[PDB]
Each structure stands twice: as C-alpha cells, then as structure tokens.
Amino acid sequence: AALTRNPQFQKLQQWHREHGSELNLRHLFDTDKERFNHFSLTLNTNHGHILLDYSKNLVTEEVMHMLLDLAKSRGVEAARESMFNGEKINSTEDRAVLHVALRNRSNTPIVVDGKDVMPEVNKVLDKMKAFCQRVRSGDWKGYTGKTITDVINIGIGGSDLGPLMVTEALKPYSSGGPRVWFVSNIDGTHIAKTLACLNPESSLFIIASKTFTTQETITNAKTAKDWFLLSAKDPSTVAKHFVALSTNTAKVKEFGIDPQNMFEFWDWVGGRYSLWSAIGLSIALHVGFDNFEQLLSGAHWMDQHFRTTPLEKNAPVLLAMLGIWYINCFGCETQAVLPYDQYLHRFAAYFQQGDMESNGKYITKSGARVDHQTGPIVWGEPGTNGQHAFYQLIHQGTKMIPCDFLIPVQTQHPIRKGLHHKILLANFLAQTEALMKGKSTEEARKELQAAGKSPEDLMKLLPHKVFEGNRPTNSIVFTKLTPFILGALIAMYEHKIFVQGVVWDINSFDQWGVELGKQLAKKIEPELDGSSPVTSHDSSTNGLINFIKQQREAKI
C-alpha cells in the first residue's frame, strides 16, 4: 500500500513521533499573536462570506507544510482534474464521478465516452423546473381536481438523506411550496405514520430509485399505491399522483407511472452525491427552482475554489489534511460535526453517509490491503443541544475528538431583538475557547479557595474541576445559511472526503460493503415463514430466528 511507503508520510510520522505530544494550543496562541491570521481563511463568494478558522488545531507552520507536501506527493491535484474531466476514477465499477457536472453552471463541456454530459444534465433540470412549475402553481391536478398540498419522497440512503437534510435546512425558503415528507425505512411504521396524515386527493409521491427495483423503496412505493387506490379506486389515476426519479422506463411504466414523468440521472452520479440531480426534485418543489439553482451555484462556486486555489489556501484540502493528521498520526477514530443551527439538525447524519460510505474502505485502488487507518466515524448533534448532552466526554473524557463547529452570523429568526442568537453565538465561541484553554489545577484551586472550601473538601473536588484542554477544533462561520451558502458547505465537505480518499489511495465512490448483508437477508426472508425451527445457519442466527418464530404469536 502506497501511503505507508510515501516519503512525505514517513517524514510526517517521524516528526509526530518526536514532537506530536508536545504540541499545546494554549502555548501556541500565547507565543504567536498572528496565529489566527496565519491559520485561517476568509472566502467571499459574493453571496456571503465563509470564515474557516483552523487555528485551534494542533499544528505549526512546519506541520502544515509537511501535510501539504504529502497532499502533493499523493497526486491530489492530478486526481482532482481527472474527476472534473470525466475520467473513470471510480476504478472498481469503471465509471466517471461527476456530481460536479450536475451543478456545472458554467456549462463548460465535460466529455464522457466521447460525449458532453452537460446537455443531458440541463435537459433534466429544465424538465424538473417545468414540472415543479405545474405542481407549485396548481396547474397540476389530483385525480379529483385539487392542487397538490403534500409531496412525499420515497427512497433510501442517498435517495433520502440529502433531500431531507436540505429541505430541513432551507425551510424558511419554502414559502409557497407544498409540504414535504420523507419515507425511507422499510419498517412499516414509517410509511404508515406518514400516510395517516395525508389526503390522497392532494398528495404527490416521488419514488426515488435508479433501477426502480430497490427492495425497500419499491415495497414502500407499492404500499403507498395501495393506500392511494383504496380511495382513488382507479389504477389509471396513479399517473397523476406518482412520479419517478429513475431510468428504468419499463419498471416505472409497469408501476403505473407515466414515462413522461420519469426524471433521470446517470451512473456517474453516486447516491450519496445525488441531491444535486433529479434526486433533488423534492428540494426544488419545496423551495422553488430559483433557490434550487442557488443551491447548485453555491456548490459550483466551491468546486471552482477547490479546482483553482493553491493547496496552501484550499479549504477542502486543508480540512482533509488536518483530518489525516488526526486520523493517521494521532489515531483518532472519530470526527464530530456540531452545527449551532437547529435547521441543520440532520447535517451531521448526512455526512455520516457521505463520509463513511465513501471512505470506510480497506482495499486500495491497486487491490492491496491498507496497513493504516482510513475513514473516521462521523457523528454529532446541532448545538447547543448536543452541548448539553455529550460535551462532558469531549471536555473531560479519555478520547481526542476533532470537532467542526459551524454557525451562521445572521439567524433566520432574529426574535427577542436577537437575544437568542446572541446567546447561541456566545456558546459557539466559548466552547471552542474552553476546549482549547482548559482550566489548570492552580486555576481551579484558587476558585475553590475563594469558594470557602475546607482543605479536605477542596482536595476531594479539585482534580474533578480541572480541564486539561488542548482539544482541537475548526470553527466555520458564514454570513447566513442561505441555499447558496448551504450548497457551498456541502460541496466543501464532499471535496474534503475526495482528498482524503486520494491520500489513502482508496476508491471513495464505490460501496461493495453492501452486498453481503443483502444476500444473507434474501436467504433468511423465506425461512421466517412458518413455525418450523431453522437450523441452516450458525447457532446464533438460528437461535434468533427461532426466538422470533416462538414470540411472533405471543399474546402479551
């Protein structure tokens, strides 16, 4: 495996082995008045500013230089061009990786198999807008003649999380749009509780599935059709309440949907990178096409930043290499994402898929097994919520946890003359300051002394009140969370993920880890039927199945 044999990597490791544990944030800031200026970057997108302050990280100019050298020697730049140029970098599936084409507002030609993909991309987009216009304006009618009031997206994984996270994040921009719902779990509870709140006469379903044969998605789609038909009765009315995001014309038409209402995307569009394509139809329907195009433009802006900016000042590259530093040198298993924004409550979950499904790999592009760590476990909750739940462990646990704190300067709801947002901002700032600064034993002793504690009571509590600090964080502040800014932020992390994948020499765009569980599930399905004991598996699987057969009848 390449990384471990790379000269720059070894130099980095050697340096960390010798000076790594010596790095101390408090000391670094105390001896360098220019630290913030030297370890941060402000980006003016013309539609708001984004400040990436990575100064509270365990790095020095020397460390950053070494990290940038590694990025260069790993061919991050050549790899980037290959992606943007339509080359088939998805080596195991022999496919191009072009979510950047989906939002290529510049319409600069991107050729794949001797053909520019932009024309087809724009064809679908125009098709999406036209349809969106009919639904939003009321022109489109239910089988009863009523306008659509609710839109239900049915899909799993990448066909669900992106649309859900974005519509949740851009709720303030949904004025005039129908309400949107998202069904994803095969668990019957999901579709059942969702359908109970809807009127079939004014409900529009969006079945999101490339092949249109995805078990969970199609099962849910069929259940929704039965629910609908229970009221509508006529199978021909389905074409008025169901549309598809797919390419399988036959299966779509067989379902009862009109091929005219099938919005397609391509194989170079990964599920976890597809909200920018037809998959984003529910987004466009909710916030309008102008806002949707703003979302795409934001991503496009960041794509250009990534492609034209020197590595030293390249946002995604910097985030990626800082992550490599903590993952491969410090050995940190996780990456926390803490947005101080309730609208971004599903932002961390979105990147759990985007990051983990992309880089949770162990085989390199050459077929060799890695002998080093790859993708981290991404997790988190919007602040200050999460702040009152698990920060205890971040501040005083036994784990080093890189944290990305994000927040918009301007709130969408400046209630109480901005009092709420002021407090939110203060906590956003105070937490990273606290994680960095900590509170020494002497500092805590003085507080306890001043609190009239007896020598005995003081000694008993003292160590518990000490904060060792030196806990690194990135602070990402943006003017306002608009469709454009959100687009830029999502694209920024998409590229961070891309860069790390290159450094580790893995394929960030396939997902073979899915078939094993899938094949074993299909084998078990028919065995669940009936009350006869199963003995064809390992004793555990056998035991579980038999307990299930025994208890499915139990009358509590």
Add this chain to the structure above:
Amino acid sequence: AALTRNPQFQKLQQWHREHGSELNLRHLFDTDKERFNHFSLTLNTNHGHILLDYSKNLVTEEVMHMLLDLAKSRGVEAARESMFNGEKINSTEDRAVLHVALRNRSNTPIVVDGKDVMPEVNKVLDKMKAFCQRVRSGDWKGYTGKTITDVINIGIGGSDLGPLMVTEALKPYSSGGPRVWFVSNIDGTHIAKTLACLNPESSLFIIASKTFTTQETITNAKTAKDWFLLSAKDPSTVAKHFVALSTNTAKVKEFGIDPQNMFEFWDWVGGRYSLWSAIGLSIALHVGFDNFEQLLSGAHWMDQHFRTTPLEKNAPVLLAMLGIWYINCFGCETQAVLPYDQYLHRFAAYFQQGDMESNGKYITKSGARVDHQTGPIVWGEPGTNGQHAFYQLIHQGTKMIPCDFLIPVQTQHPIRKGLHHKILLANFLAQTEALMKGKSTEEARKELQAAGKSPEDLMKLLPHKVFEGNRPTNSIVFTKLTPFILGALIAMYEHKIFVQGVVWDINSFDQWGVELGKQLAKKIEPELDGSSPVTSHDSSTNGLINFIKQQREAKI
C-alpha cells in the same frame, strides 16, 4: 487508578495480549454448537420476553469468567447495594443516586438523611396523575375556556431528550392525548417554528428546570410567555397556560406560575436519569398515566433483575463487561446503537447523553487520574435507515465497532400482512450474521465466476468483494415495544452504564465538564454588543468575534 492496579484486570490484559487477536467468531461458531446456548440470556418479564444474544462477541467461556471475576473484585455488587440503599455515592457532589426510587413500585423504604423518600415520590406522582386527568379530560381550560390541544415541553439536556425519545417511541399509545412538542435549543429557530403552529388559548407550556435558572430554558420560557401574553394580554392568565417541573418556588411564582402547579423532583435525580420523575409529565400527558406507570414498572422489573441476579446471568453486568472488554482491551473508541425500529429513532441520541455524560470522565473516586480508557463515544441511527448510510465502514472500514442491534418481534403496524416487518427482521438478522461470517477470498472468487465475470475483471474486483468479518455484535430482541418493555430496556442500559463506572472507579453521576464552557460564554455575551473589535481573548476567539461583528449587518 484502581482498575489498572486490579489483579483480575491485569490477568485479563495479559490473556488478551497473548490470545486476543487469535479469536475468530466464524471459527468459534464452527467448532461449538452450544455457543448460542452458552452466550445468550432470555428474560421472561411476564409482560413479554427479552433475548440478549451476546454470542457473536469475541469471547470464550474463559474470557467471560475473567470478566465476571473483574466485576466482582471491583465491587460491583456492593456498589449496587449502596446505590439502591440511598447512600451518597455521588461523591463529588455528596448526593444519593436514586432514579431507582422514582420507579420503586414495591414502595420498599429507601432512606436518605433519616427519611424515607418514597412518600414524596408517590406524592408527586399522584399530583402528576391528577393534573393529567384534568388536562386530558378537558376539565382544565385555557383563559378563553377551551380545552388543551397542545402541550409544549421547554427544557434542555436531561429535561428534554428523555421525554422526547419516549413520547416518540410510544406514539401508538397516545390516542386521546394532546399533541406534544419539545423546545430545547436556545437557537431562536426552535421556539419560533413551534410557536408558529400553536394557538395560545389551547396551548399548555411545561417549563422543565430544577433551579429554574437554566439560561436556555428560562430564555425560551420568557419568549413563550411574551408570545402568549401578546394575545392573552392579562398576566393572571399565565397560571392557566404554564406549569413547572422544578423546586424553586420563588422563581416559579415570580414567572407567574401557580406554585400548586410546580411538580418537584430531588437532587438525587440526575438530569440524564430524570424521565422517571416529574420530568416525565409530558410523557404522562401524551400516553396517559396507566401507560406511564407501565413504563415505570418496566424499569422497576429491570431494577429487580439487576439487584437479585447472580452476575453471570445479569443482563446489565454482561453488557457492561463486554463493553469493558472492547474498550480497555481492544481499544475501541465507540459503541454503536442500532435499533431496527423507526419509533426508536431518538434512542441512540438519548444514550449518547446518558452514557457519555455519565462516563466521559478521567478522575477516579480516589482523585487519581485514570491511566486507562473510560466511556466510549455512543452513536447510531435506526436500522434500515442507518444500514443504508454508514454500514459500509462497519463492514469494510479499518475500525472495530461493537454494535448493539435491537428489535421488536411484533410491530405496531403489521401492514401488508406483515411484509414490511418480515423484511426488517430478515435484515436485522442478516446484518449481524454478515458482520460475524464475512466472505473469504475463495468464496468471493466462486461468486464472481458464477456471475460470468471475465478473468481480469474478476482479478480487479476480487479483493474489494472480500469481507473479513469477525465484527462483534449483541442482538437484543423483545416480544413487542410496549411502555413496559421500553422502560425495562432503558433501565437495562442505565445499569450497564453504572457497572462500567464502578469498574473504572469513576463517578458516573456528576458532570463538572459543563462549568468552563458556561463561564466563558457569559463573559463573551456582552462583548458581542457594539461594533468595536474585541482583543481580550486568544487571537482565534478575537478573530471569530470580529468577523461576526463585521458580517452582522452585511446585506445578502
């Protein structure tokens, strides 16, 4: 630190040292037909069964004996008795830890400071039931004489997550109950979007806060009151629309709340263990008191199981020691919680707080700094969703991640004649089976050949199709997710957390980690006012504040 000096621990570590990496699940099952029988526990609660199958773990009977010996030498049994008997085991705050008293259905006396706490516990429960009856029945009217249709819980941390997670989990048992809402984030977006869907004359607010001085909660409460009075206008009507879960009579009365509508709890009720107290009022209002008592009874049943069962067959002890095995011997940073149940969509988030806030500590009860790992990072999303998001990394990443898979045999919505649940169950079973078994190079090769793959295509794909397996999991299956069973499950994990804390010799019931961040935030708040630059902090904190001031009125 006590743990490192414990002889049973050193014996365990030496064994691991010498045998650890040699353990292979597939090989263990292949060579022992009694594995499931030997490593599974079935609990009959008389109100449904709970099967704890821990056979797919990297353990042998020898390993389990060493783990149980460690639990015993660390005094888990005596510590448990001290908790149940009301001793002040919360050593740093010198307080008892009695969430078990809250659900002590048996009413066996529990003495604290020379006084049985049960009378006051039951008094509050009776008060809660009485109030709920009036609200639910429509007896309690708003200032305009209308019945209450919406209940809004305002609180943060332990005063929020439990009530939210339980009401979400028990939705099927809420018929005839008012809609419940939860406001927690200080972020104005939270209270604003909630208030926008409410009618002040039929809305009842529950302000959950012990001291009633919690900044976020009180700020949200004041905003809700201003909103209410904009319509009500008459201050005296507040007593008909606001109640409190607190003990600060002065502040409550000052807020405008009738002190007779203040439901109390005690200092031995930790926030993250408070849903069983008055904090659970929103739960009672949503599902009725009979169901709330079932929830309490379920926890009481698990409490009894924990107190009377020999360690070797004690569910919480087994879960705890398996965790210790992975944390302190294998070095796993995280613990995944994967419930295959949409209703339990906030279950993992709940324990992310319950576990991490309790055991994210680094100072032992003797004041020594731990020289070993403590609490893990808890995370997860309900199965299939999570299954289509990040399982790629669990299956083929470079991290060992213990996973708890949970699922009810009987679904609350057996739609399509049980088809959805059948698929859900098959996946629940197949996933742990796949994680254990994996797929060898030769197995994958055979599949690729049968698939008709060409020689070189097979060669390039082969390694990527291999699953190393040997990934440990616990499967927890229960007859049905009822209020009683849910209570039992929550209590089971609370005790798992307790046992681990005892083994590590830390105080699982304090949370000093909160102080530093709060103190720094209060100092920054006033500095945000005005446009003059701030220079009183480290350059990063300074720079972030100044960017905020600059961008505050940037027009986008």
